[PDB]
Paper text:
Each TSP recognizes a different lipopolysaccharide on the membrane of a different bacterial host.
This protein degraded within the period of crystal growth in poly ethylene glycol 8000 solution, yielding a structure that lacked the XD3 domain. In the following discussion, this structure is named TSP4-N250 to distinguish it from TSP4-N253, one of the protein variants that was designed to identify the TSP4-N domain interactions with partner TSPs by AUC. The TSP4-N250 structure was determined by molecular replacement. In contrast, the three linkers are conformationally disordered in the crystal structure of TSP4-N250, and bring the three XD2 domains together to interact along the crystallographic threefold symmetry axis. In contrast, the analogous binding surface of the closely associated XD2 trimer as seen in the TSP4-N250 structure, is more neutral, with three lysine residues forming a positively charged patch in the center of the solvent exposed surface. The TSP4 XD2 trimer binding surface, as seen in the TSP4-N250 crystal structure, exhibits positively charged residues at the center and negatively charged residues at the rim.
Author numbering:
A (entry chain A), B (entry chain A), C (entry chain A): 4 to 180, 187 to 250
Write the structure that this text describes.
């Protein structure tokens, strides 16, 4: 029957021992000066409730049922300063306090591993209006576009997130998220006009007066108005974007 | 005096042993291939510094002083895709990448357990303008209202949070958070007018001209103006909301 | 050669034992009713993969390579209600559900320890328009200013973050982030006018008519217009901020 020594009252040990681990069936306390640690492991293999340190991702992880080796404690924000460099490259789960006082800097998103992989940046100097920041998604696309994206808003802060490859990167958490006037004096009596870029909504002024909603229809980047206007007429148009 | 065997130089063990736990008073290292794990426990009972895995909430938790069994590592974001379904039900601490390309989908917030319980959603397809999303709070109320709430903004992302039952759910973290023109030609000489919904602020135009702030007062969904206006007068009103 | 007892088949122990720790080289399972725990430690000294509980910060921490003793699981949000008090003081990593129904309350940011140190607040009652909240940064400055900051927006929620001492505190995560009309009838024929505060952009109306972009230039808090206007002229100016 019994296969191995048993110690009714347990026992004591006054030096570091060497085990091939075990199954605990009771309570694991500590005394002062006691230390603890995790296996420095790197594999993709594991089983739920199993836990490790990682000496590459410098991140205390735990194997979850759906997925496996997530960061322990869920999602989290690694707040570090970034010393201004023309180009910088950013690591998942880290958030960067950017300075653009020097001038315009760039940052390159990492290659996404898992969905959720989440990076964060913050205009902590409020310099982005004066000296913008651009965001290189690398091979993988951002909001569908492989093309980079620029940031122009003093004081802004954004969390980027991998959504899968079609839409690629997107913004999840964040903080901090165009007055056209075409005017001229009709050389002739004219029934239509074309604005330099399509406006969403527009206000029209004919001489002094504010023209009525009925007097025109607006479509794309052109404005018809019945009745057609006479020559010598100062018309103001306020393209809204 | 002594009650149990003592091992001056500690010892060695080349197989998995079986303990009723203990109190460590020194350093707990590991060698390569070493593994670690947590008790698969489910109770509400525990004591600070005590820690576990949970085989229901699939979440590495730790008993804190104020509260008890929180998720270890504080609050975190479980980023998963959601395959479009007319109805879906959402789990705390998880964040969902929603698609509404198919059409309009719905999601039901879980029953809140603790205050803080925090869910997150994201229009990762930018389809919410074209095909909105609605948010069922279930029995418990949202911002005071038991009534559901709809979302209409292309590209949006929101973190919901339980605040307690009076106000119920609210939005904490998030990203991405109405041109009325009444016009007519006064049949008669008229001293007042009623707008179809109360405007907050309004611009008034009488014939061509932009009427002065003194000429009217505005209240609720009606506009008085002294002096009272004459008949045959084209007046434009720009309800702002 | 051998220095300490070895137990080929490992062994068993039916009571809590007392160790000076060890190096595990195998697998550390558990049985039902098994418990676990961390050393209640307080020092700044430690080595990566080492982990502890803290009986002051009531926070399960782990020593990371760059930095040392971070909270395990990265950044996280400690959601608690705050019972309205004229003054309250706030702890890092905690997020407060504020009520200002009573009246105007204040909150004092803690002294920042590490960069990243991140506090969060939320107008969960939507009372901030009616009864504002103010934010004392203490000695350390907020966005450069040592001067406090007030909050006026019903429904808002903000994450504060320590960036370093020059800019001090800033806002990273968050949710929820001025109609001047000067009018008069020119006593005389006047070529310039001064607005009570500099406007960014402005709309000008002369009698009824909306004046053209060419007719004036705007600078600081003054408006020139060529040609200079005649006396008896009702002019409206819409300061935009």
């Amino acid at each position: 029957k019994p296969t191995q020594p048993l110690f009714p009252l347990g026992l004591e040990t006054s030096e570091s021992s060497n085990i091939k681990g075990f199954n605990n069936s009771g309570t694991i306390e500590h005394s002062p000066g006691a230390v603890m640690t995790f296996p420095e492991d790197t594999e993709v293999t594991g089983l739920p409730s199993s836990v490790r340190y990682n000496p590459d991702s410098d991140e205390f992880e735990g194997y979850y049922e759906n997925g496996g080796w997530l960061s322990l404690g869920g999602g989290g924000i690694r707040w570090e300063t970034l010393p201004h460099a023309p180009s910088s490259n950013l690591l998942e789960g880290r958030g960067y306090l950017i300075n653009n006082t020097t001038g315009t800097s760039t940052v390159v998103l990492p290659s996404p591993t898992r969905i959720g992989d989440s990076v964060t940046i913050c205009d902590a100097y409020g310099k982005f209006a004066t000296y913008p920041l651009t965001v290189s998604p690398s091979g993988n696309n951002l909001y569908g576009s492989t093309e980079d994206m620029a940031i122009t808003t003093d004081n802004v802060s954004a969390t980027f997130t991998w959504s899968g490859p079609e839409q690629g990167w997107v913004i999840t958490s964040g903080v901090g998220l165009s007055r056209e006037i075409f005017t001229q004096i009709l050389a002739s009596e004219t029934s239509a006009v074309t604005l330099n870029t399509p406006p969403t909504i527009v206000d029209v002024y004919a001489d002094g007066k504010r023209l009525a909603e009925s007097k025109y229809s607006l479509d794309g980047n052109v404005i018809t108005f019945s009745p057609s206007l006479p020559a010598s007429t100062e018309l103001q148009v306020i393209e809204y974007t």
